Design an enzyme around this catalytic site. Structure first.
Site, PDB file in Angstrom:
ATOM      1  CD1 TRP B 130      48.304  43.895  37.719  1.00  0.00           C
ATOM      2  CD2 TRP B 130      48.321  42.159  39.143  1.00  0.00           C
ATOM      3  NE1 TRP B 130      47.563  44.246  38.828  1.00  0.00           N
ATOM      4  CE2 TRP B 130      47.534  43.186  39.699  1.00  0.00           C
ATOM      5  CE3 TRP B 130      48.471  40.959  39.865  1.00  0.00           C
ATOM      6  CZ2 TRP B 130      46.897  43.053  40.937  1.00  0.00           C
ATOM      7  CZ3 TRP B 130      47.835  40.826  41.090  1.00  0.00           C
ATOM      8  CH2 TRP B 130      47.067  41.868  41.616  1.00  0.00           C
ATOM      9  CG  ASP B 211      46.028  36.115  38.136  1.00  0.00           C
ATOM     10  OD1 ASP B 211      44.793  36.287  38.000  1.00  0.00           O
ATOM     11  OD2 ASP B 211      46.698  37.040  38.637  1.00  0.00           O
ATOM     12  CE  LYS B 246      40.686  43.342  37.988  1.00  0.00           C
ATOM     13  NZ  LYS B 246      42.057  42.678  37.600  1.00  0.00           N
TER      14      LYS B 246
END
Lengths: 396, 396
Positions: B130, B211, B246
């Site tokens: 990312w 993460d 999410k």
């Protein structure tokens, strides 16, 4: 890697919540963190806010990410609040607003923006200021220097000493101004004084940073912005870090704004791209719920009128508490002149209490104030005024 | 001074929103930012979240500030999700959790905490990763290096190159792992590979940073955390930056957590005090609404059951779209074999489209992917699949 981390003492303001909560004495009184309480000693959700939340419940159909700068309507509404409907700054598209997590988040975004994108090295902050200003700016990599502001013996703004200390501020330095309801002193520049500082700021080439957390709590929404607007009339460049935490009683939803002003649209748009970059490397995009509530209220005439009365009601209750505080201190046996407290604007009374005095208040009486002597007048009620005044007199 | 600020380029991911919006081509398709869409291309609020928000509307009596670390029940539920109920880490009180504005905010607080309080100077992230990982750590002045990860020829983890490339990572360097659903490759370590990495990390003295933005989207809640838990069984110290954006479809409410783990309770509590200082100097305290929703759901057996099914429903739809995508590219005459897409975990397909092909998809067909060739499979739909696949066939 963690074994040798140095211990911290908790925040001088935020550290009080834990202390207050753990205290088992039923008569405890919270005069610490600046939150509005109503006559019942509670911190209620505003009626306008609940109605807006009911609207969002039934009408929101997505939690899709906002843009990095948040809800467009929220931006438009805050610029009007800041600068005035039909302001040259809005007409000329000289201002860009990011919705942020609170006034705090807006200050940090502004600090990161300046540190990472300009030659700014230092920020000038008033001698008494909110203790978190230094932490925010230092964390961003900026030096902080103090300028004279408060005369503690006279309990007044020492304007001459302010001007004199700021002569050490160089072109390209940031100078922080509180828009209204100076924290902790409650003492604001008059219009004429704002106009003088605006002129001097232009002359000396400072970059004004306004911390505007209490719009509506001094005199009123439009009046409270006269200082900022006087600066805005004079400067090509400034930044405003504003908050809706207090004027919407929306503290925990983290609703504020960082507004960038530049000489023209081309310049502000280009610079705001870097502001967006600094946000992206922080929290990516801001939280929707609180900001949606604000935009929903501000953009609906009927709701806005309800909210504006609610804000007036908060301001007026605090003013009534301020008078009652002074009147009750006299009845409870305080010798001394506390009339300066009536002259202070906003939530706080900078009381003149000593560190040892506020410690006694907490330990012996369960009355919680900030160690600087800052007391939350907005946390005073007809029911708790007697005991807190007895406590203060007992430590004098 | 704002005229001296250099032009930024829009975020490679978040920048797509404005471009997509502005496009006037009938039939344009958004496959950019990773948000879940249902069969009709909407990004709905979960029914569990609506029920939770109804409960809050009815029962909330205040917006009074949260503590710096947010809602206690949120922290408790988070640690249970991360490490499992009855985890040694939870029972030994070795972990402390701060609620943050998204996984993004959790990464930022980790970075600020590390830069200010430790001798960490360097963070290793995957190539590719990312794009915001480097930005967040750089914001705190930390060097970010890349380690090898993806074998793009074979569409697998190049585990030998991974091990080789981390040869140079030193004792006290941070190494960042994606918990599951690697963004953007969709390839995760097997459990044996996790155990191999856990052992090497301990031997080499790295500080793992996980993460965990997609818990639940690979295989399931508990299985997705196997890698993390393998590291946690082995290490005295680690950090987890997790997101509910999410898995609760709560993107814009900014719901995340930074979890700190140390060798023991004395150490984590002392370190965590400095983590709170790092938050205070940023946005002060986190937004209540999204985290309260998550806490309300996870702490109520009935609500949690509803949510868990909604999560597996999203996962199931994405997996159907992976299969339909591969079949439809086939049907529409693609000669490149896209079968590898089926084995990718999470919302994305790392499709192997070049930067030129992605640009042509945008300009010629109104199909929006990230320039890295990352496509959002969760934005694919029975109705948009055929035109999307015809467009890809046209550019390869």
């Amino acid at each position: 890697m963690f074994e040798n981390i140095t211990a911290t003492t908790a925040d001088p303001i935020l550290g009080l919540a834990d202390l207050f909560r753990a205290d088992e004495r039923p008569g405890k009184i919270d005069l610490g963190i600046g939150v509005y309480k109503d006559e019942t000693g509670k911190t209620p959700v505003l009626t306008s806010v609940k109605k807006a939340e009911q609207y969002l419940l039934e009408n929101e159909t997505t939690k899709n990410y906002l843009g990095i700068d948040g809800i467009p309507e929220f931006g438009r509404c805050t610029q009007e609040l800041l600068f005035g409907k039909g302001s040259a700054l809005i007409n000329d598209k000289r201002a860009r607003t990011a919705q942020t997590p609170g006034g705090s988040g807006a200050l940090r975004v502004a600090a990161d923006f300046l540190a990472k994108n300009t030659s700014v090295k230092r920020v000038w902050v008033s001698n008494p200021s909110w203790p978190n200003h230094k932490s925010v700016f230092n964390s961003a990599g900026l030096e902080v220097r103090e300028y004279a502001y408060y005369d503690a013996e006279n309990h007044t703004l020492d304007f001459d000493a302010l001007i004199n200390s700021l002569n050490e501020a160089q072109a390209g330095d940031v100078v922080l101004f509180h828009g209204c309801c100076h924290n902790p002193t409650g003492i604001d520049p008059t219009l004429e004084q704002w106009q003088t500082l605006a002129q001097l700021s232009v002359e000396k080439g400072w970059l004004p940073l306004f911390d505007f957390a209490y719009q509506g709590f001094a005199r009123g929404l439009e009046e409270d912005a006269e200082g900022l607007r006087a600066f805005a009339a004079m400067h090509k460049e400034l930044i405003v870090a504003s908050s809706y935490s207090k004027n919407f009683a929306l503290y925990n939803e983290r609703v504020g704004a960082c507004t960038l002003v530049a000489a023209d649209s081309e310049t502000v748009d280009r610079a705001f791209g870097q502001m967006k970059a600094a946000i992206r490397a922080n929290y990516s995009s801001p939280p929707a719920h609180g900001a949606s509530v604000v935009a929903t209220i501000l953009s609906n005439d009927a709701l806005r009128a309800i909210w504006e009365q609610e804000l007036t009601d908060m301001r007026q209750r605090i003013q009534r508490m301020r008078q009652l505080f002074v009147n009750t201190l006299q009845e409870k046996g305080a010798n001394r002149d506390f009339s300066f407290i009536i002259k202070q604007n906003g939530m706080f009374s900078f009381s003149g209490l000593t560190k040892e005095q506020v410690l006694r208040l907490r330990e012996e009486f369960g009355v919680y104030a900030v160690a600087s002597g800052r007391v939350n007048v907005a946390g005073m009620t007809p029911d708790n005024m007697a005991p807190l005044c007895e406590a203060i007199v007992a430590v004098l």
